[PDB]
Design a protein around this ligand. Sequence first.
Ligand SMILES: Nc1nc2c(ncn2[C@@H]2O[C@H](COP(=O)(O)OP(=O)(O)CP(=O)(O)O)[C@@H](O)[C@H]2O)c(=O)[nH]1
Ligand SMILES: [Mg+2]
Ligand SMILES: [Mg+2]
Length: 180
Amino acid sequence: STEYKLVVVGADGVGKSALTIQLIQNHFVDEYDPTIEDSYRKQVVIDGETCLLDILDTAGQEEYSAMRDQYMRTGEGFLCVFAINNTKSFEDIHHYREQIKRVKDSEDVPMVLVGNKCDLPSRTVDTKQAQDLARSYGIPFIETSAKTRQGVDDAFYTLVREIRKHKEKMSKDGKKKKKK
Ligand SMILES: Nc1nc2c(ncn2[C@@H]2O[C@H](COP(=O)(O)OP(=O)(O)CP(=O)(O)O)[C@@H](O)[C@H]2O)c(=O)[nH]1
Ligand SMILES: [Mg+2]
Ligand SMILES: [Mg+2]
């Protein structure tokens, strides 16, 4: 069945790992253990298709940009995670997207904007500005909590759906031809 290369990106401490672990292992990591680079696979059924999810869980801050370039090249789809009580992490999304587009040398890259930690009262990034940004990029926005698991499956499943749409659009192309 179809394999999907997903990459989870975002600033230090937004909950990239907690989201990924909730997805894979169904528990919430309460600790803060900074990531170098972790990879996971989960077989799931999404819209009646069996998917092999190959998930890359990236570091909050890359020491070597070459390490960032590589996962942006390999990734088929990107989970762009910010925390709703971390304004800078939300601002960092623009910079991730620019870096990904440049590396892919393309304007069309499957991504989903993820506002994590929605269980907190400390919200400094409002939903509207998140929604506005996602609308601007033409990608989905999903609010999640790794603590409660709210929205976690949805975030990953939606990314898979985005990758499918892209594959279809890339077969049909926009020009240079073609496919139906
Ligand atoms: N309240 C709440 N806390 C969360 C949530 N997700 C993660 N955390 C907490 O935030 C801290 C960092 O989470 P972690 O998943 O390691 O974030 P990360 O972005 O992977 C860290 P790095 O960028 O170094 O790899 C941990 O204390 C974790 O329990 C959430 O949805 N809600
Ligand atoms: Mg991590
Ligand atoms: Mg990062």
